[PDB]
Design an enzyme around this catalytic site. Structure first.
Site, short mmCIF file in Angstrom:
data_model
loop_
_atom_site.label_atom_id
_atom_site.label_comp_id
_atom_site.label_asym_id
_atom_site.label_seq_id
_atom_site.Cartn_x
_atom_site.Cartn_y
_atom_site.Cartn_z
N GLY A 1 3.24 5.89 10.02
CA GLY A 1 4.61 5.71 9.61
C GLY A 1 5.24 4.38 10.00
N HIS B 1 0.81 -1.22 0.00
CA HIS B 1 0.00 0.00 0.00
C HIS B 1 0.84 1.27 0.00
CE1 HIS B 1 0.49 1.28 4.25
NE2 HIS B 1 0.34 0.02 4.61
N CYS C 1 4.20 1.24 9.34
CA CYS C 1 4.04 0.13 8.40
C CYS C 1 5.38 -0.33 7.87
CB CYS C 1 3.14 0.54 7.25
SG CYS C 1 1.50 0.59 7.80
#
Ligand SMILES: *[C@H](O)[C@H](C[C@@H]1CCNC1=O)NC(=O)[C@H](CC(C)C)NC(=O)OCc1ccccc1
Ligand SMILES: *[C@H](O)[C@H](C[C@@H]1CCNC1=O)NC(=O)[C@H](CC(C)C)NC(=O)OCc1ccccc1
Lengths: 294, 296
Positions: free
Chosen positions: A138, A40, A140
């Site tokens: 932030g 993503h 991920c």
């Protein structure tokens, strides 16, 4: 002195990189000449990840390993992960493997922001396939892991937070834990059940520590305990779980099914305010292995 | 939740030191290895050992120091308080930017628990008001180190030495002076009575406000002296105006004045907790500092 302890993070720290796509940035894991990050990152809500991926070039991906920039020599999609091929092999990649963690088991999380390791902590894969992590915008691409001798077993990569405050993500092949998808639609964890094996290990820990006020002389069968457990949203106990508790059974001289009869009465009568190792809540993220090791 | 600093910069400094049949961990920084001096002891751990005597009887050759597989050569040695400084032939290439600091009671740090020179676990804990640590340390853990990392510089603050009969732990800074009244001798020793770190509980109550937990606030307020009367009755450290100033930044982000929060805590101490929870716990947590709450 029974503490939640994480594995030393050094081997994983050497693998953490920052991946940036346009204006959205997150973390990647750099092993050999490949870098893994959530797919993503290539998003700007019902995304067509095949359509967005075909619309990207190797140069669109900014990969920064600390100071130096790495060049993507190619890329492909693996489930909900991207694998970016980079020109250079990480000199610091350790012996490693990818593994699919199972509910009840624990692992350490290296929470990273902008490719920089920030903190390390332990948590458990819950039965509803979420984790009660600590993850800000932030995070991920932060990775969960275990270490056995010299070998890092990677088991989690962070993708998302659910409305209940808990967290979901994938193994290192990109398959989500649980029935979650990487789109920001309404998603709900299932009802969370309690990891009974871990509550039982915590009761053994407490007995080893000197509080045994909750022990009784009642008896239970595995089946009659499991019937009660499920009424209270605790996981049924397997015969493998009984076997796993053997060493704590021996060390304390309390048979597993006798500890289950203790637990059973706690479920049914509650704790009239009494404490176990200091809290009115049964702790279910400490494994039999943790108690044994301490 | 409690989080430890990433331990990588410290892990590269961990080595194994053996004297005879006694093994513990050492901290290897540039060309010197630091380690607890009782590595030079055998049976008479418990006997008041004379460490000056035991050390005069030793040569550089008697110290087996191993960095993983490679054995380092001891070029010299000296004692500093309860630590040994071993000069090594080789300088550790992995030496981080570092300093030695002496932490104060109530302050937190990360522990890298080590065995046979090999890191095995990391966790956060606090220096207790009575100068012990509530650690998790087994046989072979001595020489494990406590540290903070903000930001590229490792601040070493603790080296592990021993476990009291109550199960808490005691150790030194990296110049080898013990925290607290303890001596490195296997005699049974008591710490002073421990207390709850009021500054840390208050910092955590601000942490709770931020992530949603507000059930415990109230319209009341109290003065410093009214509050300390209730705290002393409950074994909490007294609060000072420096503490209040330390809590200042946490007042702003919350809009809750420091002595309103004291009133909330006073009610929690006098009323107990409904069996409900604050940020997940059913106890007033005192091992997160104001500086921790801001970082996380
Ligand atoms: C990746 O950095 C991020 C991790 C979230 C950020 C908030 N706390 C986390 O753990 N993931 C997302 O932002 C995710 C993107 C989907 C396409 C997978 N959206 C999401 O989790 O929505 C929930 C949420 C977003 C922002 C704040 C709080 C919850
Ligand atoms: C060093 O590896 C070891 C770690 C201790 C022992 C197991 N758990 C620990 O935290 N330290 C010692 O064995 C230490 C050596 C002395 C010469 C300082 N002895 C010790 O901890 O004895 C236990 C004890 C000390 C003081 C009062 C009562 C018991």
């Amino acid at each position: 002195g029974f503490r939640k302890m994480a594995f030393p993070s050094g081997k994983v720290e050497g693998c953490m990189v920052q991946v940036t796509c346009g204006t959205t940035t997150l973390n990647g894991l750099w092993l050999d000449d490949t870098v893994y990050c959530p797919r993503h990152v290539i998003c700007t809500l019902n995304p067509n990840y095949e359509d967005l991926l075909i619309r990207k070039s190797n140069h669109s991906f900014l990969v920064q390993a600390g100071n130096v920039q790495l060049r993507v020599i190619g890329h492909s999609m693996q489930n909900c992960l991207l694998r970016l091929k980079v020109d250079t092999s990480n000199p610091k990649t350790p012996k490693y493997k990818f593994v699919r963690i199972q509910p009840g088991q624990t692992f350490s999380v290296l929470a990273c922001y902008n490719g920089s390791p920030s903190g390390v902590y332990q948590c458990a894969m819950r039965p509803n396939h979420t984790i009660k992590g600590s993850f800000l915008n932030g995070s991920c691409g932060s990775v969960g892991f275990n270490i056995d001798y010299d070998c890092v077993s990677f088991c989690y990569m962070h993708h998302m937070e659910l409305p209940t405050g808990v967290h979901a993500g994938t193994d290192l092949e990109g398959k989500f834990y649980g029935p979650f998808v990487d789109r920001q639609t309404a998603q709900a964890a299932g009802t969370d059940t309690t990891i009974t094996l871990n509550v039982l290990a915590w009761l053994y820990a407490a007995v080893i520590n000197g509080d045994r006020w909750f022990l009784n002389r009642f008896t239970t069968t595995l089946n009659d305990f499991n019937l009660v457990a499920m009424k209270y949203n605790y996981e049924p106990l397997t015969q493998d779980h009984v076997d796993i508790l053997g060493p704590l059974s021996a060390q304390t001289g309390i048979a597993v099914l006798d500890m289950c009869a203790a637990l059973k009465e706690l479920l049914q009568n509650g704790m009239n305010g009494r404490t176990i190792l200091g809290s009115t809540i049964l702790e279910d993220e400490f494994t039999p292995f943790d108690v044994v090791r301490q």
